[PDB]
Design a protein around this nucleic acid. Structure first.
Ligand SMILES: [K+]
Ligand SMILES: [K+]
Ligand SMILES: [K+]
Ligand SMILES: [Mg+2]
Ligand SMILES: [Mg+2]
Ligand SMILES: [Mg+2]
Ligand SMILES: [Mg+2]
Ligand SMILES: [Mg+2]
Ligand SMILES: [Mg+2]
Ligand SMILES: [Mg+2]
Ligand SMILES: [Mg+2]
Ligand SMILES: [Mg+2]
Ligand SMILES: [Mg+2]
Ligand SMILES: [Mg+2]
Ligand SMILES: [Mg+2]
Ligand SMILES: [Mg+2]
Ligand SMILES: [Mg+2]
Ligand SMILES: [Mg+2]
Ligand SMILES: [Mg+2]
Ligand SMILES: [Mg+2]
Ligand SMILES: [Mg+2]
Ligand SMILES: [Mg+2]
Ligand SMILES: [Mg+2]
Ligand SMILES: [Mg+2]
Ligand SMILES: [Mg+2]
Ligand SMILES: [Mg+2]
Ligand SMILES: [Mg+2]
Ligand SMILES: [Mg+2]
Ligand SMILES: [Mg+2]
Ligand SMILES: [Mg+2]
Ligand SMILES: [Mg+2]
Ligand SMILES: [Mg+2]
Ligand SMILES: [Mg+2]
Ligand SMILES: [Mg+2]
Ligand SMILES: [Mg+2]
Ligand SMILES: [Mg+2]
Ligand SMILES: [Mg+2]
Ligand SMILES: [Mg+2]
Ligand SMILES: [Mg+2]
Ligand SMILES: [Mg+2]
Ligand code: NA
Ligand code: NA
Ligand code: NA
Ligand code: NA
Ligand code: NA
Ligand code: NA
Lengths: 54, 151, 214
RNA sequence: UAGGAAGACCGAUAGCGAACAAGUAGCGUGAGCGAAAGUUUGAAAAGUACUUUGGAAAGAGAGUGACAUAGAACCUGAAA
RNA sequence: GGGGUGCCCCCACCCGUCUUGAAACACGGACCAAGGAGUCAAACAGACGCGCAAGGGAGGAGUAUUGUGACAACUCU
RNA sequence: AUCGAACCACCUAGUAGCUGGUUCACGUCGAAGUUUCCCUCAGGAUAGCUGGUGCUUGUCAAGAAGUAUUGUGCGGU
RNA sequence: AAAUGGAUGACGCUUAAGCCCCAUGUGCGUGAUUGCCCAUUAUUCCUUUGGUGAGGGCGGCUAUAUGGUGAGAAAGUGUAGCCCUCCCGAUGUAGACGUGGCGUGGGGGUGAGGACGAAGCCGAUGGCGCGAGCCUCGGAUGGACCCGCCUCUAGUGCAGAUCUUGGUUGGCGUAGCAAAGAUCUAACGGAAUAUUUUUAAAUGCAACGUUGGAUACUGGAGCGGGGAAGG
RNA sequence: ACGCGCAUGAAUGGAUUAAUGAGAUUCCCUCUGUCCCGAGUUACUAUCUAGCGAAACGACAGUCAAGGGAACGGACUUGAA
RNA sequence: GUUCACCCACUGACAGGGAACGUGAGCUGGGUUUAGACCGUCGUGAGACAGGUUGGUUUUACCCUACUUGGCUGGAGAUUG
RNA sequence: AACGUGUCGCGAUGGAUGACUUGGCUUCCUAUUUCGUUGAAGAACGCAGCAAAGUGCGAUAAGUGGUAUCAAUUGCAGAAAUUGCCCAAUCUUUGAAC
């Protein structure tokens, strides 16, 4: 039985979840630490090439 | 392998056959009747069954088979004359006799001391039934092992 | 699925401080499993000269001198093949955790690498996963003098805030004295305790009667 | 298309349909549908010469091997 | 003392299920092996654990690192 | 071998207030089939019955009682 | 006055073993106040388990080697319960909650075991626990890995779903193998014989191909001779 | 044949029709095992043997009377085999 | 089609009923109650009628018991003392 | 009696369990990284001493040429090269197919 709860508005009625019949619509961040290393490496390479410009 | 060990191995001959293409139930009755018999007596009985003068008693697998007057000597009423199983057992008894001769024993004094029949792997065929059905049609071979000792 | 977790910054610093204080108690070090029976003093502080080593033989001689070779021998004997499916997934061998050596920076470790059963640490970033392996406190730690002298600045005192962590100070104790048994047996407490009362004799054989009429 | 790093994942009815001559064998006029199956004997074939019964298949001996109740789709070998 | 197999006297309707009511002339039930069903994400509420408190906490990014390195550490008019 | 709307693949694990199933042990407690509203009558929401967590207290008794007595009112079987 | 043969439960009972009423041991008109039988009830005793549980001890100086007596004592919800006394409750569908409660795959720690034999499998192998289960023994089994404890994690426990996939099964040597007329004989071939030790028949049956002969069928809209489609 | 026809009737066709029909109904001749009332015979089965060899179904099982019970029991109570 | 009904005839007499309104793995399939089709009445129509009419697959026993026949064989401490 | 029932030892039938794993699934990174009328992708037919499938190759057909390495291949032959990489070539009948 429902009691005294807030009225839910969860907004999840489209096909976002990948299943056997749907491609889905999602985004994850498993590449976050690898991309952090890549951006720093590019900045260091660019500094070496354009030396001594700021 | 053999399921029993003869007490005196020197005076004992053995023989066996595997995947014999004979009905297991028929061979079961044919081989079991000669346990405890003398070798010559067992050979005589098989020859008389081929002549249809004596019969093999069916004791376990005998559901709704015919009655015979020749089964009274076994204290029973049901019996039959399976020729295919009998000729196979006669061949096996000849092999065991050859083993005894090579070992140096006398075949005229040997006594059968162990007989065993088991079910072998089955072979599959098929038969056609009404309304487009197919049902199995299987064959049931058997293994036979025995040995006899000289008292 | 939610693979990772968030932890409050203050709680993470709390855990590191507590695991460090546990390493100064020789009873807790022995309970975790380390062999420190030949160690001169705890916490163990050695001279800075160990950073100039270049040959592994010199490091082994130094470990035997300060008495830390018993723990590294214990790790050597414990090496064995893992039980179960884990040996099929690039986890074939297992071993125990030995002593940890703390250096002021990430330099001077060539002679101490390749020694089985020894761990290197940098005082500027201490890892709780290394200080309390398996969640159990009391790791055996060997300090260099330079790294030891930086502990006051890195973590701060009970009144002076730290200089490396923004506005961090050591948490105050809940009890001014942890020895509770002394308080219970002190003269001040025993003055106001209620007096003892006489107790009856022990019951003998010959069970007592109950029929008041017969 | 070439390469690398791996995993608190699955472990042959699981994991891709496919650990194997697998989009194969097979099915349907066709569009299409679609398996089963670890060759896991032994460190090494050293894979049982030879005697004897048998038309043969095989049986009884003998031999190799630590073990043959490890004998060839051969580790272990449960229940009905 | 325990275990196995009989025997004697006494006691004793077939399991699971829906149902007011099942031993039912109500349904599912030949046997064995291996599989087989309250999970993950997101918003909110209450109970309980932990840190700080008129304040609490970030995120995204950045600073320094073949080293247990996709971790851990640091980022304050 | 398909027709009061063929066959193949896909949307599709279509929805089902309806039928069937739902895997270890011991311990402390333990019901309801009634009220009001609903295109409601094989279903829900709502109060009641129950469990858990307690809070504030007391220790012979506060705001105790499915029971009597005394006094004082009500009634039309 | 009814449809199977049948019901004081049956047999039977008539100085009742029927109906109404009255009594009680040894001694029924002299023994006043219990004739006897049967409960998961009542009283009492022992043990367990849970409490709105109730009390007590816990600052270890009497003295003591082996070949006057020997072991424990934890300030504690929860145990192999810190220990000792005492009191009150204990069944239960749907349902709620508790458990230093049991079991499975893998991670972090700690401690072990193994070719003098790991996992797995087998059992008239016993012991422990209320129980889920745990441990030992034997193997005339196996041939290379695996477990105890604290924590983390999950594709984590089966008797049934006209459940899925394999295997096995009574029925059972049973039901049957009955349209299209039908074969016989000698010789040869074949391992398929003329097979006996313990006269000939009553102890090697049954069945196969070719050739010669016999018998019989198809009966030119043919079990004749040629083609297409399909193979 | 008759007609107050619940509710016959005119291309929602009315009335009648020789020939035709594996169409529905009644009667007659002939004929018969359809029957009174069954009997005898043949071929192939079943039945026995040699060879070969399934399926369906299958909680567990299988003697009755009365009783009560979910108001028609193989299991329960009492009796009888 | 009938249960029922009503007539003809014989007879001593042509009584009334039950057993899952006994009896379909015993038969039969005339009726009732699918799909085709005609008529009357009703309905705008698709169609309806407890109104009439004609045509319309009747499956399986080899299991247990019961019953009918048919045989083998122990047994009184009803297998033992 | 026989059939039938039960227990123990051994043997059949069957392929579970355990230990193994050149397979799968999921996430991350780096490039002088993106086909074809100069005939692609797909489809058919062939090629080895013994060669059915699969693999490689195209009438120069389990390969020709260059280069690095340095003695094999292996079931039996047979001889006295093989393996990795890649510039030079060959490349049957078709297919956008013209
Ligand atoms: K027969
Ligand atoms: K036969
Ligand atoms: K036969
Ligand atoms: Mg990216
Ligand atoms: Mg028959
Ligand atoms: Mg057929
Ligand atoms: Mg057909
Ligand atoms: Mg698979
Ligand atoms: Mg094996
Ligand atoms: Mg009902
Ligand atoms: Mg029930
Ligand atoms: Mg009933
Ligand atoms: Mg679903
Ligand atoms: Mg249900
Ligand atoms: Mg209660
Ligand atoms: Mg409304
Ligand atoms: Mg009575
Ligand atoms: Mg209870
Ligand atoms: Mg319950
Ligand atoms: Mg798992
Ligand atoms: Mg599961
Ligand atoms: Mg199971
Ligand atoms: Mg037959
Ligand atoms: Mg027939
Ligand atoms: Mg003719
Ligand atoms: Mg003719
Ligand atoms: Mg009209
Ligand atoms: Mg007109
Ligand atoms: Mg009209
Ligand atoms: Mg005509
Ligand atoms: Mg006609
Ligand atoms: Mg009855
Ligand atoms: Mg019944
Ligand atoms: Mg009636
Ligand atoms: Mg009837
Ligand atoms: Mg019928
Ligand atoms: Mg009828
Ligand atoms: Mg009937
Ligand atoms: Mg009709
Ligand atoms: Mg052209
Ligand atoms: Na018979
Ligand atoms: Na598959
Ligand atoms: Na029901
Ligand atoms: Na139902
Ligand atoms: Na219902
Ligand atoms: Na012809």
């Amino acid at each position: 039985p429902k009691g005294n709860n807030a009225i839910p508005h969860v907004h999840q009625r489209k096909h976002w979840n990948p299943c056997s019949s749907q491609k889905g619509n999602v985004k994850v961040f498993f590449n976050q630490p690898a991309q952090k290393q890549r951006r720093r490496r590019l900045r260091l390479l660019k500094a070496k090439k354009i030396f001594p410009r700021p | 392998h053999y399921s029993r060990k003869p007490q005196v191995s020197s005076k004992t001959a053995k023989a066996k056959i595997a995947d014999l293409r004979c009905h297991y139930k028929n061979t079961f009755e044919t081989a079991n009747v000669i346990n405890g018999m003398k070798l010559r007596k067992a050979q005589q009985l098989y020859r008389q069954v081929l002549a249809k003068t004596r019969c093999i008693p069916f004791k376990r697998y005998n559901g709704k088979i015919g009655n015979t007057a020749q089964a009274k000597e076994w204290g029973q009423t049901k019996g039959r004359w399976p020729r295919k199983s009998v000729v196979a057992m006669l061949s096996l008894l000849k092999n065991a006799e050859a083993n005894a001769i090579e070992k140096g024993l006398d075949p005229g004094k040997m006594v059968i001391k162990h007989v065993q029949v088991d079910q072998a792997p089955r072979v599959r065929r098929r038969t056609f039934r009404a309304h487009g059905r197919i049902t199995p049609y299987m064959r049931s071979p058997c293994h036979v092992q025995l040995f006899m000792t000289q008292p | 699925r939610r693979w990772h977790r968030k932890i409050n910054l203050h709680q993470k610093r709390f855990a590191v401080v507590s695991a460090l204080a546990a390493s100064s108690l020789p009873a807790l070090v022995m309970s975790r499993g380390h062999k420190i029976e030949n160690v001169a003093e705890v916490p163990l502080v050695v001279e800075d000269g160990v950073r100039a080593y270049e040959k592994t033989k010199e490091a082994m001689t130094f470990l035997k001198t300060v008495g830390a070779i018993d723990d590294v021998n214990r790790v050597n004997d414990s090496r064995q093949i893992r039980a179960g499916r884990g040996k099929m997934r690039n986890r074939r061998y297992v071993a125990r955790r030995g002593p940890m050596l703390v250096m002021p920076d990430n330099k001077g470790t060539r002679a101490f690498r390749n020694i089985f059963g020894l761990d290197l640490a940098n005082v500027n970033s201490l890892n709780l996963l290394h200080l309390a392996p398996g969640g159990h406190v009391g790791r055996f730690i060997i300090w260099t003098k330079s790294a030891f002298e930086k502990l006051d600045k890195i973590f701060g005192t009970f009144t002076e805030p730290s200089t490396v962590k923004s506005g961090f100070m050591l948490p105050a104790p809940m009890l001014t004295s942890t020895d509770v048994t002394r308080i219970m047996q002190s003269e001040e407490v025993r003055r106001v305790l209620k007096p003892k009362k006489l107790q009856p004799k022990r019951p003998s054989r010959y069970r007592q009667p109950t029929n008041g009429i017969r």
